């Protein structure tokens, strides 16, 4: 639609500059519509970023749902690698939306609440799998599962997103998946 | 001095509202000086937060230097707990400066560079200790030490600061030290 064109324009421009430096007029021009026509689709450029983030977050969530329904046939190291890889590939394929969406957590209650809702969901799912591993005798009962899950999820948020943004310091993007898998597997299966 | 009074006023006000909602006039009034007298001590309210952050960061750094010079007489779990505790206690004793200083990373190159410099230093020291543990045969050679150190340091930044801010999600403050120690010890000593 024109909606999909505004979203694509926003994602393209965000690869060059922050949302602060993008105007409604910029988004309209790229989508081949006028400013008032823009306001028919979105109330604000902040609504455009919220929608972009919502789509990327739901893409990751559905990928993880897909894996949870269809468990891959592998050792525990590859089970966790496959789950972390959802986030690495999904967010790493949308770096500009990731960077801008994280930055908007500071200024938008709707972005903060979106991020908070899905992090809670991914932590609860992490904990449920760690608890399943403990129930079947493959993982030791150490930390409370939900506390362990929370810190591992927060580690992944900061570490993946520092890598994608090329922050100093950061793990290089080509090393970050193996880095996180090591810490997940040792902390989940380690006495 | 009047300098110390401005710094104390800023830290007190930051416990109530963001730097965005604090004026130079607010800082002058609390310190018992006029606005132009304020500008004799600091160029801007942003300089006041930079100085507060610089003092808290250097306090943590010196505490860690103190431990590095005078190694406590304990098992490896208590060695790592004592190091992480520097950050938990130092930043956890200055939550308002922590929150505001992290938020200012987005808008101030000097705050971003301060934070980046010390994180590099703390990661290099982490890696140097992991490498010492590997050299003496107490830790296995798994991940490259500096990559492991980077992800553990970034985990601590996000997890400690989410706890202090009471974010949803977060580990409760009373559980966060034990949570992080578990993940450091298992990931550093785990095959
Ligand atoms: O990174 C994460 N969070 C942070 C997100 C960020 F960074 F902020 F973007 C994150 C990583 C992994 C999981 C997860 C849960 S359970 C599992 C195992 N795979 S599984 O059960 O789906 C599976 C995989 C393969 C075979 C069988 C089951 N992996 C959840 C969250
Ligand atoms: O949390 C950290 N970083 C993130 C900071 C944040 F969160 F962003 F604020 C952080 C935690 C621990 C260390 C560290 C290095 S080495 C050691 C062992 N203790 S030691 O060598 O100093 C020691 C202790 C006791 C006995 C002997 C030696 N601990 C470094 C950094």
Whole-number Å distance between alpha carbons of B83 and B64: 7
Whole-number Å distance between alpha carbons of A86 and B25: 50
B40 plus B4 within the same structural domain = yes
Q: Nearest-CA distance from B153 to chain A in Å?
A: 9
Ligand with the closest atom to the CA of B153: 2
Domain with residue A9: its CATH number is: 1.10.10.60
Choose one of A56, A133, A156, A180 to mutate for the ligand 1 pocket test, by most ligand atoms within 8 angstroms of C-beta: A156
For chain A, how far is it from start to end, CA to CA, in angstroms?
Answer: 54
**Do the beta carbons of residue B156 and residue A157 sit within 8 Å?**
no
CB atoms within 10 A of CB B72: 10
Q: How far is CA B9 from the centre of its chain?
A: 21
B55 plus B97 within the same structural domain = yes
DSSP 8-state class, residue A33: S
CA distances from A29 to A5, A11, A36 (A): 10, 14, 12
Atom from ligand 2 closest to the CA of residue B90: 9
Whole-number Å distance between alpha carbons of A21 and A10: 11
CA of A126 to the centre of ligand 2 (A): 27
Question: Out of B120, B159, B175, whose CB is closest to A169?
Answer: B120
**Do the beta carbons of residue B90 and residue B60 sit within 8 Å?**
yes
B98 plus B163 within the same structural domain = yes
B110 plus B39 within the same structural domain = no
Within chain B, residue ranges assigned H as helices are 2-14, 24-31, 35-41, 45-69, 76-92, 95-104, 109-135, 145-164, 173-189
Whole-number Å distance between alpha carbons of B30 and B8: 9
Q: Is A129 in the pocket of ligand 1 (CB under 6 A)?
A: yes
A155 plus A185 within the same structural domain = yes
B61 plus B37 within the same structural domain = no
Whole-number Å distance between alpha carbons of A57 and A109: 16
CA distances from A109 to A97, A106, B17, B64 (A): 17, 8, 17, 37
In terms of Cβ atoms closer than 10 Å to its own Cβ (0-12, 13-18, 19+), residue A116 is middle
How was this model experimentally determined?
X-ray
Angle between helices A145-164 and B145-164 in degrees, nearest 10: 110
Question: Out of B152, B158, B171, whose CB is closest to A147?
Answer: B171
Could you give the angle at the alpha carbon of B174 between the alpha carbons of B80 and B63, nearest 5°? 40
Atom from ligand 1 closest to the CA of residue A160: 7
Angle between helices B109-135 and B145-164 in degrees, nearest 10: 130
Domain with residue B84: its CATH number is: 1.10.357.10
Half-sphere exposure of A82 (CA within 13 A, CB side): 16
B38 plus B54 within the same structural domain = no
Using CA coordinates, name the residue in chain A closest to B185: A187
What are the two backbone dihedrals, phi and then psi, of residue B18, each rounded to the nearest 5 degrees? -70, 160
DSSP 8-state class, residue B21: G
Ligand with the closest atom to the CA of A116: 1
A91 plus A156 within the same structural domain = yes
Q: Is B20 on the interface with A (CB under 8 A)?
A: no
Number of domains observed in the structure of chain A? 2
Domain range holding B27? 1-44
A37 plus A56 within the same structural domain = no
DSSP 8-state class, residue A20: G
A1 plus A84 within the same structural domain = no
Resolution at which this structure was determined, Å = 1.8
In terms of Cβ atoms closer than 10 Å to its own Cβ (0-12, 13-18, 19+), residue B39 is middle
A1 plus A57 within the same structural domain = no
B108 plus B128 within the same structural domain = yes
- How many residues comprise chain A? 191
**Do the beta carbons of residue A154 and residue B159 sit within 8 Å?**
yes
Whether omega for the bond prior to residue A155 falls within 30 degrees of 0, making it cis, is no
CB atoms within 10 A of CB B101: 25
Residue B32 gets the label, from left (phi > 0), alpha (psi -120 to 50) or beta, of left
Q: Which H/E stretch holds residue A56?
A: helix A45-69
């Amino acid at each position: 639609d024109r909606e999909l064109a505004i979203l694509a324009t926003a994602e393209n421009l965000l690869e060059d500059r922050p949302l602060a430096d993008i105007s409604v007029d910029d988004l309209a021009k790229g989508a081949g519509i006028s400013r008032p026509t823009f306001y028919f689709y979105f109330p604000s450029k902040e609504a455009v970023l919220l929608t972009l983030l919502d789509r990327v977050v739901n893409q990751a969530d559905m990928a993880l749902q897909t894996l949870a329904e269809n468990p891959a046939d592998t050792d525990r190291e590859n089970m966790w690698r496959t789950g972390i890889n959802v986030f690495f590939e999904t967010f790493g394929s949308h770096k500009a939306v990731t960077r801008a969406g994280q930055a908007a957590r500071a200024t938008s209650v709707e972005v903060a609440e979106l991020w908070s809702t899905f992090m809670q969901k991914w932590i609860a799912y992490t904990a449920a799998v760690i608890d399943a591993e403990r129930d079947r005798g493959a993982a030791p009962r150490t930390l409370p599962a939900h506390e362990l899950a929370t810190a591992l999820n927060l580690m992944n948020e900061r570490t993946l997103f520092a890598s994608f943004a090329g922050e100093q310091p950061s793990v290089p993007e080509a090393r970050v998946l193996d880095t996180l898998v090591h810490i997940w597997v040792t902390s989940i299966y380690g006495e």
